[PDB]
Structures are given as C-alpha cells and as structure tokens.
Design a protein around this ligand. Structure first.
Ligand SMILES: Nc1nc2c(ncn2[C@@H]2O[C@H](COP(=O)(O)OP(=O)(O)O)[C@@H](O)[C@H]2O)c(=O)[nH]1
Ligand SMILES: [Mg+2]
Length: 386
C-alpha cells in the first residue's frame, strides 16, 4: 500500500502544535479524503506506557495523495522529553512549530537539541500565527533566527522548509490559510525521504535464548530486528565477550524449517561450531562488520519520578545502576554533566556511561536503567565513545 511515515509536532508551549495537528487532519481530509480531527480530541491526549514510563501522547493519522502518516502530538514539554528519549514515537521527521508572535523560545531550542541527540533525521518548520503579524521584516527575522538555531544543532537550517501560516485560520476554514497547510503536507511528502525498511537494513537478531539440540548443534532464538539471515551465510556473535564468527546452518519457526529468517519473525537460528557455553545473555547475531561492541557512550536519559515507580531518592556521580540493552542488564558507572552533582527523580540529563561488559550498539539504541530488575530510567545512546 501507501508508504507509512512517522511524524510529529515539536516546539514550545502554546506555539500551536495541537491547532496545527487538527488543521492538518482537517485540511487533508477535505482535500484528499480521510477523517478530520478537532482540536479538543487531540489536545485531550490519552496516557500510554512502555519501557516503564508514562507519557501523554495523541496519535493521529492522515494521508497525502501518496503517503500515510502516523503523527504524534503531546500536551506538555515533559511528554516530549519522555517520548523523544524512549521512542514511544520514533519520528522519521518532525514539524517544528514556532509562533511568529514570539519567535523561538526555550522549548524551541530544547526540542531541537533533543531531536539531534536522539537522531530525529529531518525537521520542517511551520511558522505559525502569521495571521497575528503583518510585518514581513519581522517574519523574515524570525525565520533567520530559526534557521540559525537549527544549524547550531547541526540540522541543515539554510535548506529547511519553512511555511508561514495560521493553524487557527486554517482550522477555521479560511481557504487562503488552508493552502499553507497543503504546502506543509507537500514538504512532509517531498522533504522527508521514504524511511529505510527494517528488511533492507543489515541483519541483526538479539539472542533471547539458546538450546543445545539434536545432533551437535546450538540454536539461538530471537526476533529478527533487521535484514535477513539466509542459510549458508556467516554471522558475527557480538557483545559481552570477544566477537566470534559462525555460520547459519538452519533457520526454523516452530516445526517449519526455513531457508531464511526475515525482519519481524521470531526464529531459531542454527549455528555451526559454536557450543552453548560460548553464548552469553545480551549478545546479538549480526551481519559481519556491521555493528561493533562498545562499553562507553554518551546518552540522554530520563529518570522516572517516584510517582511513576522510579527511585524515591536522588543519585550522584557514584551511581552504578544496571543498563538493560535489548535483553539483559549490564552494570555501568556514570559521569554527570558539567554543573550537575545531584539527579532528582523526574529529571532528564545527558549521561556518559561505561558498562562493565561490551554491548553491540550504534547511536539511537534504546536502553532501560534498572535497579534490582526494576526500571528506574530510560535512555538512548546519543554517541558511542569506545
Ligand atoms: N491567532 C492564532 N492563534 C493560534 C494559532 N494557532 C494556535 N493558536 C492559539 O494558540 C493557543 C495555543 O495553541 P495550541 O495548539 O494549544 O498550542 P500547543 O501548546 O503548541 O499545542 C490556543 O489559543 C490556539 O487557539 C494561529 O495560527 N493564530
Ligand atoms: Mg498542544
């Protein structure tokens, strides 16, 4: 069917993220077909939980002539912080809403900064509330400021699409302003490339279990997160101990014996010449030379509030929690940012971590911070260091 693209609105409080999300669904419904959604339905976001965190997020769907979008919009700045760090969402692109009446504000900068830390790949801007400002000189200056802010965080500010519009008058039915929503939807379609499919990425399978089987073989089980493993191909077993090479001599699903395992399937992968005791929890299977084992990384983390079931007590530079990467806990030590010495429940910070065992990782890998098997925080690898 139609390509599916994950997007969302980001930007400072009251700059109009919700009004825009409802305008997009409404204008697109009236122009290309679908269901309009009103302000009040999106603004009243439900709660959701995963990785052990609670976030208020509205999920909306809309279509352009050629694509289908799943769009996320959230009530407060804290919701955005939580969603960006985990991957409740996992935006292929974001719409940064900047009210022309205020220019960029503190949360404008923070959402861009986090977008980069967490690897949001593209940002398009909707310069909202242009029905309140006549002055073209002022609109031009606001645009220049946003482009500069974007480039400070490494986004291509000079080449970023910026639409001048009014989410409110578009929502209200003013054709001239509705046309700017259609321009925005055009940039979602032309500026965000079709996302790479998991199936097209290098093979990767987090090992969930291991069995010594029949003849002499060890089988490792897990879900194919990415790519495809074919019988006869070589694999690296990466993480925890020194990388090993092996060959897939079999792929099975229940009683079905297959010639390959593909993205999204739960399989058992038969490994040649590896004994059960060479397999450790936390290891992954990967296409060789495609992911490396690391111990040290920079991350952005959100620490759960007491209320969300997180710690009730703050932590300091000596904190030595477990970092749960895909399938298992790995203890690590932390390094706190400049200034900081106390991290309160409910806080989000950049944290440098050193694990005691290497984990196959690349930027964007998510993790849970655990304490005696209880989730107390959530993070994303922003930069692998060694
Ligand atoms: N005049 C005007 N007001 C707007 C526009 N977009 C949003 N608003 C108002 O700004 C306030 C904040 O909008 P909202 O969508 O809730 O902002 P959010 O906090 O970013 O979601 C509400 O009163 C909206 O009606 C616009 O284009 N023009
Ligand atoms: Mg809102």
């Amino acid at each position: 069917t139609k390509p599916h693209v994950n997007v969302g609105t980001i930007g400072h409080v009251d700059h109009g993220k919700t009004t825009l999300t409802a305008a997009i669904t409404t204008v697109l419904a009236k122009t290309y077909g679908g269901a309009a959604r009103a302000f009040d339905q999106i603004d009243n976001a439900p709660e959701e939980k995963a990785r052990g965190i609670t976030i208020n997020t509205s999920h909306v769907e809309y279509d352009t002539p050629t694509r289908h979008y799943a769009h996320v919009d959230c009530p407060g700045h804290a919701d955005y912080v939580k969603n960006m760090i985990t991957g409740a969402a996992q935006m292929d692109g974001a719409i940064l809403v900047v009210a022309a009446t205020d220019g960029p504000m503190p949360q404008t900068r923070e959402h861009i900064l986090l977008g980069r830390q967490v690897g949001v790949p593209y940002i398009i801007v909707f310069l909202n509330k242009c029905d309140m400002v006549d002055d073209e000189e002022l609109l031009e200056l606001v645009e220049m400021e946003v482009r500069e802010l974007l480039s400070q965080y490494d986004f291509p500010g000079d080449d970023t699409p910026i639409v001048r519009g009014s989410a409110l008058k578009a929502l209200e039915g003013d054709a001239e302003w509705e046309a700017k929503i259609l321009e925005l939807a055009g940039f979602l379609d032309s500026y965000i490339p079709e996302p790479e499919r998991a199936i097209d990425k290098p093979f990767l399978l987090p090992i969930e279990d291991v069995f010594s089987i029949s003849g002499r073989g060890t089988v490792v089980t897990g879900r194919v997160e990415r790519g495809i493993i074919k019988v006869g191909e070589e694999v690296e077993i990466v993480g925890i101990k020194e990388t090993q090479k092996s060959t897939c001599t079999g792929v099975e699903m229940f009683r079905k014996l297959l010639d390959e395992g593909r993205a999204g399937e739960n399989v058992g992968v038969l490994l040649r010449g590896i004994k059960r005791e060479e397999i450790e929890r936390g290891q992954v299977l990967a296409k060789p030379g495609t992911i490396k084992p690391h111990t040290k990384f920079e991350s952005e983390v959100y620490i759960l509030s007491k209320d969300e079931g997180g710690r009730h007590t703050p932590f300091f530079k000596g904190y030595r929690p477990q970092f749960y990467f895909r399938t298992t806990d790995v203890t690590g030590t932390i390094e706190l940012p400049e200034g900081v010495e106390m991290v309160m429940p409910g806080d989000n910070i950049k944290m440098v971590v050193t694990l005691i065992h290497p984990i196959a990782m690349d930027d964007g890998l998510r993790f849970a911070i655990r304490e005696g098997g209880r989730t107390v925080g959530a993070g994303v690898v922003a930069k692998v260091l060694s």
